[PDB]
């Protein structure tokens, strides 16, 4: 006889449908079909079934609607019993997977020769939710990556100034994003771009 | 089971409501698309898209309504509105037409995301209620006139019903 | 009604003559995006003349006539004659049913309540089997179920398309028993 799955937790990517997942838990040796209910304070959505291929994961066929309390729960059946795990409500706003901010480009001045200038291309997400950054640089030949203090980039802006690089170096630099607030997870690295300073 | 109400604070249910409006007030994100994919892409005829009176209440009347009767003619509205939506959906052209015809499936995609906007505010403004607890024949050149002239009351209608909301900030 | 004709099916390429009654002055006209000189008639009212009409797309090349006060206009629908079904095979899989597989071939570039109507009927029986609205993307090529007869094996059967525009049959005879 099977036990009750728990670690649930579900993530939204942009502009996708909602997956979720558990745990598989004890083996028993007997075949058993997983299936989470999902549901609105009035509307009961459809099911899922969990594949033979990955019995812990599914990709749920309704679209996603933001800032609308959703309560998921996972019920376990076999062929001697049936368990529902916990039931939790979760916004799906919070759990946004932005994408990395693109067309990222490094211009210098001719009038002082320790500063960079970054541009780049916010994704469709601003205009929903407000997101910070994380801009890291390092020196051409050295691997260690360094990273600017979030407290200059911890709003919305698609411009950014580096400064103390005094003699005529070569650097690259990466931005990745996520929401403000820190609710959600963290978006991957944008294309390495290059910059010279000035001499 | 299930729960009556989504949620049981009063201050992120009020966000949600004002996140929600604002997010739908965006003619560029419904109106735009039904006149890109009819064709109406003319500076003249895309003058001609302003919304007849009486289509919707008008914003004198939404700031004189109270916090009941607002909610209760809300939901009325969004249900005519869905109705004709689907109305309008059932007559809006198919996918691969689209493809051979040139235009963009992005309309179709925002009208098909639109609707149930429309039904989790539904959802939001009865979990908001729950929370307090205190034309024969017409041508075919016509109707879309009527469809735009109908998207664009409906946008002025988001507009008002937004400001209402972002209105009264925070109260027991 | 102001603009004649109304929702009229033309063929692609031919030449068609609209024309506006109407008491006030009319300023121009324009066929989506091109503009047409107008032709005087007798009164206000005005005609244009339309040659070598292009392929006209799901909504219709909508012709508008603009005044200084309102808008009018129609729509105009030109499309093809239907092509004439493609590669039709029967077979069975039960010996209770038979499908009759077949490519539509051409697009007739008409869709809405115009769509080519596919009626396949037998010939030794007389029976006939009609499509209904739905309908299938050519990626899964066409197919129709048909009830086997009771002690019968030859079938010899046609199959007709039609438009409004047009139509197109085709016809092929079968030995049911080779066709498992
Ligand atoms: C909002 O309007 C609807 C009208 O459609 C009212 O009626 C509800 O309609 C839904 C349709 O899915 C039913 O599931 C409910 O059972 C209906 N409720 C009742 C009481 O008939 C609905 O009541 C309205 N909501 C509020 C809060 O007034
Ligand atoms: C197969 O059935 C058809 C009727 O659907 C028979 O009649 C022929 O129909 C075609 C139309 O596609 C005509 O061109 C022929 O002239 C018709 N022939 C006759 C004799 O009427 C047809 O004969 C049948 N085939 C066989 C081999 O019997
Ligand atoms: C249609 O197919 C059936 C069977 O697939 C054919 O019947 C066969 O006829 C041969 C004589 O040539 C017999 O030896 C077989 O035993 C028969 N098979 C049966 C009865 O199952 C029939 O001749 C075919 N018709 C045509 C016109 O070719
Ligand atoms: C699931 O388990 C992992 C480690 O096994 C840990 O992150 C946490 O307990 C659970 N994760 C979540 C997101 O609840
Ligand atoms: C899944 O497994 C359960 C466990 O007995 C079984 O009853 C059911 O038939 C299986 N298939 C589906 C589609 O539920
Ligand atoms: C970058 O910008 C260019 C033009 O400014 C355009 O192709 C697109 O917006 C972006 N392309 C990529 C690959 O990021
Ligand atoms: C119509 O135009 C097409 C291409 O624009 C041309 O090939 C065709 O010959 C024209 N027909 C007539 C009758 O002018």
Same mark, same amino acid.
């Given at each position: 006889?099977?036990?009750?799955?728990?670690?649930?937790?579900?993530?939204?990517?942009?502009?996708?449908?909602?997956?979720?997942?558990?745990?598989?838990?004890?083996?028993?040796?007997?075949?058993?079909?997983?299936?989470?209910?999902?549901?609105?304070?009035?509307?009961?959505?459809?099911?899922?079934?969990?594949?033979?291929?990955?019995?812990?994961?599914?990709?749920?066929?309704?679209?996603?609607?933001?800032?609308?309390?959703?309560?998921?729960?996972?019920?376990?059946?076999?062929?001697?019993?049936?368990?529902?795990?916990?039931?939790?409500?979760?916004?799906?706003?919070?759990?946004?997977?932005?994408?990395?901010?693109?067309?990222?480009?490094?211009?210098?001045?001719?009038?002082?020769?320790?500063?960079?200038?970054?541009?780049?291309?916010?994704?469709?997400?601003?205009?929903?939710?407000?997101?910070?950054?994380?801009?890291?640089?390092?020196?051409?030949?050295?691997?260690?990556?360094?990273?600017?203090?979030?407290?200059?980039?911890?709003?919305?802006?698609?411009?950014?100034?580096?400064?103390?690089?005094?003699?005529?170096?070569?650097?690259?630099?990466?931005?990745?994003?996520?929401?403000?607030?820190?609710?959600?997870?963290?978006?991957?690295?944008?294309?390495?771009?290059?910059?010279?300073?000035?001499? | 089971?299930?729960?009556?109400?989504?949620?049981?604070?009063?201050?992120?249910?009020?966000?949600?409501?004002?996140?929600?409006?604002?997010?739908?007030?965006?003619?560029?994100?419904?109106?735009?698309?039904?006149?890109?994919?009819?064709?109406?892409?003319?500076?003249?005829?895309?003058?001609?898209?302003?919304?007849?009176?009486?289509?919707?209440?008008?914003?004198?009347?939404?700031?004189?309504?109270?916090?009941?009767?607002?909610?209760?003619?809300?939901?009325?509205?969004?249900?005519?509105?869905?109705?004709?939506?689907?109305?309008?959906?059932?007559?809006?052209?198919?996918?691969?037409?689209?493809?051979?015809?040139?235009?963009?499936?992005?309309?179709?995609?925002?009208?098909?995301?639109?609707?149930?906007?429309?039904?989790?505010?539904?959802?939001?403004?009865?979990?908001?209620?729950?929370?307090?607890?205190?034309?024969?024949?017409?041508?075919?050149?016509?109707?879309?006139?009527?469809?735009?002239?109908?998207?664009?009351?409906?946008?002025?209608?988001?507009?008002?019903?937004?400001?209402?909301?972002?209105?009264?900030?925070?109260?027991? | 009604?102001?603009?004649?004709?109304?929702?009229?099916?033309?063929?692609?390429?031919?030449?068609?003559?609209?024309?506006?009654?109407?008491?006030?002055?009319?300023?121009?006209?324009?066929?989506?995006?091109?503009?047409?000189?107008?032709?005087?008639?007798?009164?206000?009212?005005?005609?244009?003349?339309?040659?070598?009409?292009?392929?006209?797309?799901?909504?219709?090349?909508?012709?508008?006539?603009?005044?200084?006060?309102?808008?009018?206009?129609?729509?105009?629908?030109?499309?093809?004659?239907?092509?004439?079904?493609?590669?039709?095979?029967?077979?069975?899989?039960?010996?209770?049913?038979?499908?009759? $597989?077949?490519?539509?071939? !051409?697009?007739?570039?008409?869709?809405? =309540?115009?769509?080519? &109507? @596919?009626? /396949?009927?037998?010939?030794? $029986?007389?029976?006939?089997? !009609?499509?209904?609205?739905?309908?299938? =993307?050519?990626?899964? &090529? @066409?197919? /129709?179920?048909?009830?086997?007869?009771?002690?019968?094996?030859?079938?010899?059967?046609?199959?007709?398309?039609?438009?409004?525009?047009?139509?197109?049959?085709?016809?092929?005879?079968?030995?049911?028993?080779?066709?498992?």
């Amino acid at each position: 006889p099977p036990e009750k799955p728990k670690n649930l937790s579900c993530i939204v990517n942009e502009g996708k449908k909602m997956r979720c997942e558990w745990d598989g838990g004890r083996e028993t040796h007997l075949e058993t079909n997983f299936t989470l209910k999902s549901e609105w304070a009035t509307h009961k959505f459809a099911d899922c079934k969990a594949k033979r291929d990955t019995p812990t994961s599914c990709t749920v066929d309704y679209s996603t609607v933001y800032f609308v309390n959703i309560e998921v729960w996972v019920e376990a059946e076999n062929a001697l019993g049936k368990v529902t795990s916990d039931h939790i409500n979760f916004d799906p706003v919070y759990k946004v997977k932005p994408n990395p901010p693109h067309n990222l480009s490094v211009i210098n001045s001719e009038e002082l020769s320790s500063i960079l200038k970054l541009t780049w291309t916010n994704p469709s997400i601003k205009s929903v939710i407000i997101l910070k950054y994380n801009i890291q640089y390092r020196t051409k030949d050295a691997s260690t990556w360094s990273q600017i203090p979030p407290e200059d980039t911890a709003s919305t802006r698609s411009s950014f100034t580096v400064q103390d690089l005094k003699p005529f170096t070569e650097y690259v630099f990466r931005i990745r994003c996520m929401k403000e607030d820190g609710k959600g997870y963290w978006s991957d690295w944008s294309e390495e771009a290059s910059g010279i300073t000035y001499e | 089971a299930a729960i009556g109400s989504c949620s049981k604070e009063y201050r992120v249910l009020l966000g949600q409501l004002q996140k929600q409006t604002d997010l739908m007030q965006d003619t560029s994100r419904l109106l735009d698309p039904y006149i890109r994919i009819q064709g109406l892409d003319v500076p003249k005829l895309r003058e001609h898209c302003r919304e007849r009176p009486g289509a919707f209440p008008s914003e004198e009347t939404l700031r004189g309504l109270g916090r009941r009767g607002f909610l209760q003619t809300l939901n009325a509205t969004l249900g005519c509105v869905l109705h004709r939506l689907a109305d309008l959906e059932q007559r809006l052209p198919k996918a691969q037409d689209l493809e051979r015809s040139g235009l963009n499936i992005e309309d179709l995609e925002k009208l098909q995301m639109a609707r149930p906007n429309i039904l989790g505010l539904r959802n939001n403004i009865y979990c908001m209620a729950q929370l307090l607890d205190n034309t024969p024949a017409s041508d075919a050149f016509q109707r879309k006139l009527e469809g735009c002239r109908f998207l664009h009351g409906y946008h002025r209608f988001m507009h008002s019903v937004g400001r209402v909301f972002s209105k009264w900030g925070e109260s027991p | 009604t102001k603009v004649f004709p109304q929702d009229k099916v033309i063929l692609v390429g031919s030449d068609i003559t609209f024309c506006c009654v109407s008491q006030e002055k009319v300023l121009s006209a324009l066929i989506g995006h091109t503009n047409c000189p107008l032709i005087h008639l007798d009164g206000e009212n005005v005609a244009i003349k339309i040659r070598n009409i292009s392929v006209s797309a799901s909504s219709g090349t909508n012709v508008v006539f603009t005044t200084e006060d309102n808008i009018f206009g129609t729509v105009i629908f030109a499309g093809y004659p239907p092509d004439t079904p493609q590669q039709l095979n029967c077979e069975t899989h039960d010996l209770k049913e038979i499908i009759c $597989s077949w490519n539509p071939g !051409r697009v007739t570039a008409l869709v809405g =309540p115009r769509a080519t &109507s @596919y009626t /396949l009927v037998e010939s030794f $029986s007389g029976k006939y089997v !009609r499509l209904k609205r739905a309908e299938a =993307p050519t990626n899964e &090529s @066409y197919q /129709l179920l048909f009830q086997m007869l009771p002690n019968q094996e030859i079938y010899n059967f046609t199959l007709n398309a039609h438009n409004p525009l047009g139509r197109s049959q085709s016809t092929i005879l079968v030995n049911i028993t080779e066709k498992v």
